[PDB]
Design a protein around this motif. Sequence first.
Motif, short mmCIF file in Angstrom:
data_model
loop_
_atom_site.label_atom_id
_atom_site.label_comp_id
_atom_site.label_asym_id
_atom_site.label_seq_id
_atom_site.Cartn_x
_atom_site.Cartn_y
_atom_site.Cartn_z
N UNK A 76 -42.58 57.61 -28.00
CA UNK A 76 -42.97 56.27 -28.34
C UNK A 76 -41.77 55.35 -28.18
N UNK A 77 -40.60 55.84 -28.62
CA UNK A 77 -39.34 55.09 -28.55
C UNK A 77 -38.94 54.80 -27.12
N UNK A 78 -39.20 55.77 -26.26
CA UNK A 78 -38.90 55.65 -24.84
C UNK A 78 -39.85 54.61 -24.23
N UNK A 79 -41.16 54.79 -24.47
CA UNK A 79 -42.19 53.91 -23.94
C UNK A 79 -42.05 52.45 -24.35
N UNK A 80 -41.47 52.19 -25.52
CA UNK A 80 -41.30 50.83 -25.99
C UNK A 80 -39.97 50.23 -25.58
N UNK A 81 -39.13 51.04 -25.00
CA UNK A 81 -37.81 50.60 -24.58
C UNK A 81 -37.73 50.28 -23.08
N UNK A 82 -37.45 49.03 -22.80
CA UNK A 82 -37.34 48.46 -21.48
C UNK A 82 -36.26 49.06 -20.64
N UNK A 83 -35.27 49.65 -21.29
CA UNK A 83 -34.21 50.29 -20.53
C UNK A 83 -34.57 51.74 -20.16
N UNK A 84 -35.21 52.41 -21.12
CA UNK A 84 -35.66 53.78 -21.09
C UNK A 84 -36.92 54.03 -20.29
N UNK A 85 -37.89 53.17 -20.49
CA UNK A 85 -39.17 53.28 -19.82
C UNK A 85 -39.20 53.56 -18.31
N UNK A 86 -38.59 52.68 -17.54
CA UNK A 86 -38.51 52.78 -16.08
C UNK A 86 -37.86 54.06 -15.60
N UNK A 118 -28.14 56.37 -16.70
CA UNK A 118 -29.55 56.07 -16.63
C UNK A 118 -29.89 55.52 -15.27
N UNK A 119 -29.05 54.63 -14.79
CA UNK A 119 -29.29 54.07 -13.50
C UNK A 119 -29.26 55.11 -12.36
N UNK A 120 -28.34 56.08 -12.42
CA UNK A 120 -28.25 57.12 -11.39
C UNK A 120 -29.50 58.01 -11.46
N UNK A 121 -29.94 58.29 -12.68
CA UNK A 121 -31.10 59.14 -12.84
C UNK A 121 -32.28 58.49 -12.12
N UNK A 122 -32.40 57.20 -12.39
CA UNK A 122 -33.44 56.38 -11.82
C UNK A 122 -33.45 56.45 -10.30
N UNK A 123 -32.27 56.46 -9.70
CA UNK A 123 -32.16 56.55 -8.29
C UNK A 123 -32.11 57.98 -7.83
N UNK A 124 -32.46 58.91 -8.69
CA UNK A 124 -32.45 60.28 -8.27
C UNK A 124 -31.11 60.79 -7.76
N UNK A 125 -30.01 60.28 -8.30
CA UNK A 125 -28.68 60.75 -7.92
C UNK A 125 -28.26 61.84 -8.87
N UNK A 126 -28.89 63.01 -8.75
CA UNK A 126 -28.62 64.11 -9.68
C UNK A 126 -27.19 64.52 -9.96
N UNK A 127 -26.40 64.76 -8.93
CA UNK A 127 -25.04 65.20 -9.18
C UNK A 127 -24.14 64.10 -9.70
#
Length: 162
Positions: A76-86, A118-127
């Motif tokens: 719920x915390x993730x879903x309501x968070x604009x930074x976390x959600x995406x 978070x931003x790298x995760x978003x871009x699928x930059x795993x390493x």
Amino acid sequence: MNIFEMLRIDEGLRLKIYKDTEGYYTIGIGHLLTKSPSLNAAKFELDKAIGRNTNGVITKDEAEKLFNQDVDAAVRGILRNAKLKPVYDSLDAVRRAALINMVFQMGETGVAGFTNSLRMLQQKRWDEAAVNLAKSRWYNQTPNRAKRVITTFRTGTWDAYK
């Protein structure tokens, strides 16, 4: 394997009040009771959560109950968070569990603080995220748990938990 199994592994299961990595009163599968240095304040909070006089002891069922509630709050915390959600929306089923783990562990506010990772995760930059997540205070304070979560994000497999 899933978030439930993953969390049980990471937090373990205790039926009597205990101290967490921060020294705070907790119970079951990492259900924080209070940040108060008072154990009676802890018991007090517990009775009021369980709804009976527990004397600081609960059943497995009661524990599983708080757990299920705690897991739902996390998402719920993730879903309501604009930074976390995406970031959530973008990750796969296994990687999402790693994110829920983090939220469970440090709270939504603590996680949204991980701007660069978070931003790298978003871009699928795993390493890149792994390297990054690796130099955070979270990693130096709870390296064992962080390493398993970092492996999960890096690989997208349950390997670290097997």
